[PDB]
Amino acid sequence: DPVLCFTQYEESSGKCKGLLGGGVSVEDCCLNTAFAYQKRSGGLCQPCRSPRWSLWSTWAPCSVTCSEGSQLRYRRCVGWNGQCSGKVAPGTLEWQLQACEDQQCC
Amino acid sequence: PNLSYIIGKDTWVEHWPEEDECQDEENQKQCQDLGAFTESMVVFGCPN
Amino acid sequence: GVAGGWGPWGPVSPCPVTCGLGQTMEQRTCNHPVPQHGGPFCAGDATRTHICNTAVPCPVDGEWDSWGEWSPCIRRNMKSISCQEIPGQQSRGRTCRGRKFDGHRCAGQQQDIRHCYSIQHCPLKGSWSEWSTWGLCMPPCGPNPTRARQRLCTPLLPKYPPTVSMVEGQGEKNVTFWGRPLPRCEELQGQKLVVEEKRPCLHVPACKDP
Numbered sequence: 001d002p003v004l005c006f007t008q009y010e011e012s013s014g015k016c017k018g019l020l021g022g023g024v025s026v027e028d029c030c031l032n033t034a035f036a037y038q039k040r041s042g043g044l045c046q047p048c049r050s051p052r053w054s055l056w057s058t059w060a061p062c063s064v065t066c067s068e069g070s071q072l073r074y075r076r077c078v079g080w081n082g083q084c085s086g087k088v089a090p091g092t093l094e095w096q097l098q099a100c101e102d103q104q105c106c
Numbered sequence: 107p108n109l110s111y112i113i114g115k116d117t118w119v120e121h122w123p124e125e126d127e128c129q130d131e132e133n134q135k136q137c138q139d140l141g142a143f144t145e146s147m148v149v150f151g152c153p154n
Numbered sequence: 155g156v157a158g159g160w161g162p163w164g165p166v167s168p169c170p171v172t173c174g175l176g177q178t179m180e181q182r183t184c185n186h187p188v189p190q191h192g193g194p195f196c197a198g199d200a201t202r203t204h205i206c207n208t209a210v211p212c213p214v215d216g217e218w219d220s221w222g223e224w225s226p227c228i229r230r231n232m233k234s235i236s237c238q239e240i241p242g243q244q245s246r247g248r249t250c251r252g253r254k255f256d257g258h259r260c261a262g263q264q265q266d267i268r269h270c271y272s273i274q275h276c277p278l279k280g281s282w283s284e285w286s287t288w289g290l291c292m293p294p295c296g297p298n299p300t301r302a303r304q305r306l307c308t309p310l311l312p313k314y315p316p317t318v319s320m321v322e323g324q325g326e327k328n329v330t331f332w333g334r335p336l337p338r339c340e341e342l343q344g345q346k347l348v349v350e351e352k353r354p355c356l357h358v359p360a361c362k363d364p
């Protein structure tokens with residue numbers, strides 16, 4: 001199945017940068033492992049290199065403005081042909097949940 | 107200053123591969139072991 | 155008010171890459187009609203791009219894996235230097251992984267040695283550590299996440315010389331304790347090693363697509 005072939009993967013944001021063109025197979029696009037591919041412009045940009053974890057995203061806002069709450073941050077495994085640390089396929093998500101406190105008293 | 111070292115029956119020589127040559131899995135261990143002998147002799151010397 | 159238009163497409167460029175995929179481009183000009191005193195602007199794009207496929211594989215440089223486990227802390231031509239004032243050494247190894255297609259080889263020392271004392275299974279005293287920092291709410295996205303902090307029986311490391319100075323090239327090497335000791339301490343809450351406590355995390359947000 002053909003796919004959109006991009007020339008660069010940002011990794012810092014998981015975006016597909018530098019569109020090379022479309023109408024080409026995935027095996028041909030990832031012959032250069034520095035490239036990246038995505039289906040149309042819906043998202044989920046996968047680089048053609050070895051799968052490696054991205055950077056932890058910023059903490060989501062605390063679920064409550066009062067007392068103790070909980071906040072999340074994500075990290076996406078991005079790559080091609082292989083797995084991240086933990087038998088993780090490219091595209092899966094990993095979360096860290098931490099107790100937050102915007103205001104200590106309600 | 108005309109000293110010359112003659113290769114004889116008491117001399118021992120073995121090749122030490124360069125950095126890029128060390129990446130073969132069998133020459134990996136050679137560059138490992140040749141590096142341990144390096145640090146071993148200088149710091150601990152001999153108990154003899 | 156003259157309407158401009160495109161001219162003939164020039165020669166196509168060869169595939170600039172010898173491996174994988176590249177980009178060739180064709181170029182045209184708006185030189186035959188030319189917009190005069192206004193008009194439009196030839197309408198469209200004067201540059202076409204096309205992908206060329208050489209159908210031959212291409213490289214990737216190997217990366218260092220994480221450092222392995224430290225070897226046992228021993229001394230040459232001596233037995234176990236455990237629970238003794240005898241500084242030893244221990245080694246550690248790395249593995250170059252991912253190098254394919256004539257890629258650049260891993261750069262750096264794949265072996266690592268440091269000096270050490272041996273407290274493997276050495277009976278020592280201990281004292282309860284303070285409450286550790288609250289961990290993560292686990293399981294995330296799962297039913298009812300809970301944190302966890304703990305106090306543990308921390309061994310009282312013996313006051314040995316942290317640095318041993320050798321000559322030859324006047325080399326001083328840091329000495330680091332290695333091994334799993336047996337910390338002795340009074341019971342706290344019916345436990346001798348580690349006593350922890352959990353608290354549920356409040357107002358847990360749902361895990362959705364970014």
Ligand SMILES: *[C@@H]1O[C@H](CO[C@H]2O[C@@H](C)[C@@H](O)[C@@H](O)[C@@H]2O)[C@@H](O[C@@H]2O[C@H](CO)[C@@H](O)[C@H](O)[C@H]2NC(C)=O)[C@H](O)[C@H]1NC(C)=O
Nearest residue numbers: 266267268269270314315316317318325326327328329330
């Ligand atoms: C071995 O120790 C040296 C010396 O620095 C540390 O030495 C300890 C004995 C102790 O006094 C500790 O407080 C001290 O930091 C390390 O070299 C560097 O030294 C400077 C000067 O104090 C420190 O600020 C650095 O943190 C320290 N480490 C660096 C720059 O990486 C040395 O790193 C350490 N390990 C090895 C392998 O030599």
Ligand SMILES: *[C@@H]1O[C@@H](C)[C@@H](O)[C@@H](O[C@@H]2O[C@H](CO)[C@@H](O)[C@H](O)[C@H]2O)[C@@H]1O
Nearest residue numbers: 063064065066067068102103105106357
């Ligand atoms: C953020 O600011 C706080 C000061 C509150 O106004 C929050 O609203 C809600 O107020 C009720 C009490 O009226 C609390 O029980 C809630 O915890 C709090 O979320 C506001 O979101």
Ligand SMILES: *[C@@H]1O[C@@H](C)[C@@H](O)[C@@H](O[C@@H]2O[C@H](CO)[C@@H](O)[C@H](O)[C@H]2O)[C@@H]1O
Nearest residue numbers: 032034170171172173174210211212213
């Ligand atoms: C042409 O012959 C091939 C057999 C390879 O050796 C090619 O090398 C590769 O060229 C492209 C850019 O031209 C780079 O992306 C690769 O990193 C490089 O290895 C050669 O050009």
Ligand SMILES: *[C@H]1O[C@H](CO)[C@@H](O)[C@H](O)[C@@H]1O
Nearest residue numbers: 053054055056057074075
């Ligand atoms: C998130 O966690 C730490 C930084 O807080 C690093 O392991 C890395 O940056 C990861 O993305």
Ligand SMILES: *[C@H]1O[C@H](CO)[C@@H](O)[C@H](O)[C@@H]1O
Nearest residue numbers: 056057058059060071073
């Ligand atoms: C979340 O926590 C703080 C901000 O509240 C920072 O360390 C950083 O923004 C992190 O993503």
Ligand SMILES: *[C@H]1O[C@H](CO)[C@@H](O)[C@H](O)[C@@H]1O
Nearest residue numbers: 158159160161196197198
């Ligand atoms: C140039 O491009 C196309 C023909 O290639 C038309 O839109 C028009 O002729 C324009 O001048």
Ligand SMILES: *[C@H]1O[C@H](CO)[C@@H](O)[C@H](O)[C@@H]1O
Nearest residue numbers: 160161162163164180182
């Ligand atoms: C270039 O493209 C086509 C021919 O390939 C035509 O529209 C025209 O000749 C243009 O110059």
Ligand SMILES: *[C@H]1O[C@H](CO)[C@@H](O)[C@H](O)[C@@H]1O
Nearest residue numbers: 218219220221222248266
């Ligand atoms: C091993 O050594 C340290 C971690 O102890 C880092 O430099 C790196 O993780 C390396 O693989």
Ligand SMILES: *[C@H]1O[C@H](CO)[C@@H](O)[C@H](O)[C@@H]1O
Nearest residue numbers: 221222223224331332333
């Ligand atoms: C060796 O040293 C300690 C264990 O004594 C840890 O930092 C780690 O296990 C390393 O491999």
Ligand SMILES: *[C@H]1O[C@H](CO)[C@@H](O)[C@H](O)[C@@H]1O
Nearest residue numbers: 280281282339340341342
């Ligand atoms: C930990 O608990 C108390 C101190 O809180 C003492 O019995 C002793 O120090 C033990 O290690």
Ligand SMILES: *[C@H]1O[C@H](CO)[C@@H](O)[C@H](O)[C@@H]1O
Nearest residue numbers: 282283284285286304305
């Ligand atoms: C944890 O609990 C309190 C502080 O919250 C103290 O008794 C002590 O710091 C302990 O480690």
Ligand SMILES: *[C@H]1O[C@H](CO)[C@@H](O)[C@H](O)[C@@H]1O
Nearest residue numbers: 099285286287288289303
């Ligand atoms: C966890 O809870 C709070 C921080 O949220 C503090 O009492 C301390 O950091 C503890 O480890």
Ligand SMILES: [Mg+2]
Nearest residue numbers: 151152153154
């Ligand atoms: Mg002697």
